[PDB]
Amino acid sequence: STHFDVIVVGAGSMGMAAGYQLAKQGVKTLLVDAFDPPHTNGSHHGDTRIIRHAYGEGREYVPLALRSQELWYELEKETHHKIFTKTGVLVFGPKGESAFVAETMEAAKEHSLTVDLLEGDEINKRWPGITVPENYNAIFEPNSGVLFSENCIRAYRELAEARGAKVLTHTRVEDFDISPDSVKIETANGSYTADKLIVSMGAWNSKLLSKLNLDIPLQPYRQVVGFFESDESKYSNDIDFPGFMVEVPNGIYYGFPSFGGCGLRLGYHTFGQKIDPDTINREFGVYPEDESNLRAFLEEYMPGANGELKRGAVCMYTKTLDEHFIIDLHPEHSNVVIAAGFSGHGFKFSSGVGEVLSQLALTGKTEHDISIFSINRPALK
């Protein structure tokens, strides 16, 4: 008995940002989520997320990162929740052996981003607590940093709801019925209709996009983050220990300085268990890899942060074959917008993606360059 302008299915990182953008424009919006965001079942918990700007993954990512950054600063001003701390982001790796480092350096040059370049002992001297070999080099971005991701979603929700967005929690969408002039969703709590649909179900996109007649390779991965007791005189945000994403011979790791004596947070990016989001084991430590992969990094590169394990979190990535996002209209339904496959690096962009999704839903087009995120691209298979 209630026809909405837009329904957003999956009110997480991308969905809640879209909800905020839509509500701000007086668009009558319903957001439906299987839980009550922010929560610990999806891809947005573990407290913190890196935002960096020197994005070597593709030129289209840079303006999206910079727009997202400005949007995060706007959110900071609009809410009482903490959104962003400017820790800086450090990227390091062996000289001439890391594509990730090389691409980051190239991106900073190409887009005139403010960065410091240093190598070997310079890294260790500037940040006590980091121990890299002399043959390592680094690029440091002073103006990027750390987002409080759960706070971001909660702030967007509070703001969207205040503007009149409706949020239906603990409600799993089970099926879709799409018409030329309308959209319909089916849930155990009831059916809802709108003019437009945004689909942003995270890891569950890999199970439920088939109900929209889509067959896109999306693989969900179990990705843990550990929290460790650290030397506060070295690893605290207060002493300018940076956020980091680094490439070493056995893969990519990311982490965060200790905030308020919380301890250093570390994750292993390039490995995770292939899982199903409905059967994933969400206890940290159930596989030996959970703790051991992290300690192997810390004992070598950040020895003073290799203390007691305080706790861990179990989170999910959803990967496409090319590790680029999917942000596009449904190829058969212009009234259906898809946001999927953020491939473990989407959160920093979620504010900007919210903007893109709102524009696609309302106009079928966006001012942003999203060509590399096309749902019809051959590399998606």
Residue ranges that bind ligand FAD, judged by CB under 6 A: 9-15, 32-35, 37, 41-44, 46, 49-50, 172-173, 200-202, 204, 208, 223, 225, 254, 267, 315-317, 342, 344-348
State which residue, 92 or 342, has the beta carbon closest to ligand FAD.
Answer: 342
Instruction: Please tell me the distance from the alpha carbon of residue 44 to that of residue 60, in angstroms, as a whole number.
Output: 23
Residue 208 annotated as binding site: no
Q: For residues 33 and 247, which CB has a smaller minimum distance to ligand FAD in the complex?
A: 33
Q: Is 304 annotated as a binding residue?
A: no
C-alpha triplet 220, 285, 234: angle, nearest 5°: 100
- Answer whether 222's CB lies under 8 Å from 231's CB: no
Instruction: Compute the distance between CA of residue 14 and CA of residue 287 in angstroms, rounded to an integer.
Output: 30
Which of 84, 342, 347, 373 is the binder for Cl ion (CB under 5 A)? 342
Choose the one of Cl ion, ligand FAD, none that binds residue 262, judging by a C-beta under 5 to 8 angstroms depending on kind: none
254 in contact with Cl ion (CB under 5 A): no
Closest by Cα among 189, 204, 270, 229 to 39: 204
261 is in an annotated binding site: no
Read off the DSSP letter of residue 258: B
Site track 5-44 with Cl ion (rule: CB under 5 A), x = hit:
--------------------------------------x-
Shortest gap between Cβ of 141 and ligand FAD (angstroms)? 13
Could you tell me which residues come within 8 angstroms of residue 190 by beta carbon, excluding any fewer than 6 positions away?
none
Reading the block at residue 334, the tokens are: 């212009």
User: For the residues of 131-178, what is the DSSP string, one character each?
Assistant: ---TTEEEEEETT-EEEEHHHHHHHHHHHHHHTT-EEE-S--EEEEEE
Closest approach, Cβ 221 to ligand FAD, in A, equals 8
Site for Cl ion in 312-341 (CB under 5 A): 317-318
* Residues contributing to the annotated binding site for FAD: 5-35
Q: Report the interface residues with Cl ion, using CB under 5 A.
A: 43, 317-318, 342, 344
